[PDB]
Amino acid sequence: HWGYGKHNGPEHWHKDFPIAKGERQSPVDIDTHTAKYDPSLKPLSVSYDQATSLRILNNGHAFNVEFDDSQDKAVLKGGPLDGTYRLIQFHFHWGSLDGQGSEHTVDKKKYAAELHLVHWNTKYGDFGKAVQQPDGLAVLGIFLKVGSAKPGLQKVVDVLDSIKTKGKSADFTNFDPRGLLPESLDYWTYPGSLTTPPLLECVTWIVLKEPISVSSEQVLKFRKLNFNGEGEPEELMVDNWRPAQPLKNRQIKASFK
Ligand SMILES: NS(=O)(=O)c1ccc(NC(=S)N[C@H]2CCN(c3cccc([N+](=O)[O-])n3)C2)cc1
Ligand SMILES: [Zn+2]
């Protein structure tokens, strides 16, 4: 019964998921002055032209846009990664107000929201096997700030009224995730974890430096979703973010000088 409420939030997760206090937990604060430029990193390769979106689901914690990952259609390669990672889903974390919502922070700055594009390593054959491995997932993280509308986000915003409550889904075909990227693919990278239970330490994090701009109207529609199921007391889906975790014995590397 984990969540983001007064009594089941991140400070409680360690009781059911002791890895919550582990050596490679996410998210983290990115100290821009201590992150080292690594000239040996490669440009990231984001190959989304053949992406097949299928469905959008309110899972009670966020909403997931789900992809066909039954073959190598939408893949992330290069940068810090060895081999090929298949896009399985994306989701967001956001705040009750614009001054909070991101999971990663940049010099302790909180963004209004953060997009996670989740990919799994095809050398492990399926997602459930990949999450048992230290290099099993690659998550591309993109900050959202409030300003101009993001045109590529509006198809997502406009379906949210149809998946208001936990367990609701809707058909969501032909959505192009390239419309969610910023101009620059400059990034920071570090080894971490899932940011929700079960908090598995299986993620190569790749966090873009350049945020995307969304409008106030767009993020207000995220904040009208519900954590609760249909006919249950209304609990607005806001502040579904985990705060920064200790960095411990880890180095954040920058792709840019
Ligand atoms: N915040 S975060 O980015 O650290 C992060 C947190 C949690 C997850 N959990 C994920 S992607 N869980 C999996 C379990 C299986 N799974 C599938 C599998 C096949 C098809 C679908 N589907 O519904 O289309 N979903 C989703 C990953 C990433
Ligand atoms: Zn996430």
Curated annotation (Swiss-Prot):
Changing N59D: Strongly reduced activity. Residues 1-256 form the Alpha-carbonic anhydrase domain. GO terms for biological process: angiotensin-activated signaling pathway; carbon dioxide transport; morphogenesis of an epithelium; neuron cellular homeostasis; positive regulation of cellular pH reduction; positive regulation of dipeptide transmembrane transport; positive regulation of synaptic transmission, GABAergic; regulation of chloride transport. Changing K15E: In Jogjakarta. Changing E103 to A/Q: Strongly reduced CO(2) hydrase activity. It catalyses: hydrogencarbonate + H(+) = CO2 + H2O; urea = cyanamide + H2O. CDD domains: alpha_CA_I_II_III_XIII. Changing Q89P: In OPTB3; in Czechoslovakia. Changing H61G: Impaired activity, not rescued by 4-methylimidazole (4-MI). Zn(2+) binds at H91, H93, H116. Changing E114Q: Strongly reduced activity and sulfonamide affinity. Its cofactor is Zn(2+); Co(2+). Changing Y4F: Enhanced activity. Changing N59A: Reduced activity. Activated by X-ray, histamine, L-adrenaline, L- and D-phenylalanine, L- and D-histidine, L-His-OMe and beta-Ala-His (carnosine). Optimum pH is 6-8. It is found in: Cytoplasm; Cell membrane. It is an enzyme of class 4 (lyase). One of its GO terms (cellular component) is cytoplasm. The record marks Y4, N59, N64 as: Fine-tunes the proton-transfer properties of H-64. Substrate binds at T195, T196. Changing H116 to D/N/Q: Reduced activity. It is linked to Osteopetrosis, autosomal recessive 3: A rare genetic disease characterized by abnormally dense bone, due to defective resorption of immature bone. Osteopetrosis occurs in two forms: a severe autosomal recessive form occurring in utero, infancy, or childhood, and a benign autosomal dominant form occurring in adolescence or adulthood. Recessive osteopetrosis commonly manifests in early infancy with macrocephaly, feeding difficulties, evolving blindness and deafness, bone marrow failure, severe anemia, and hepatosplenomegaly. Catalyzes the reversible hydration of carbon dioxide. Can also hydrate cyanamide to urea. Stimulates the chloride-bicarbonate exchange activity of SLC26A6. Essential for bone resorption and osteoclast differentiation. Involved in the regulation of fluid secretion into the anterior chamber of the eye. Contributes to intracellular pH regulation in the duodenal upper villous epithelium during proton-coupled peptide absorption. Interacts with SLC4A4. Interaction with SLC4A7 regulates SLC4A7 transporter activity. Interacts with SLC26A6 isoform 4 (via C-terminus cytoplasmic domain). This is Carbonic anhydrase 2. It comes from Homo sapiens. The lineage of its organism: Eukaryota, Metazoa, Chordata, Craniata, Vertebrata. The gene is CA2.
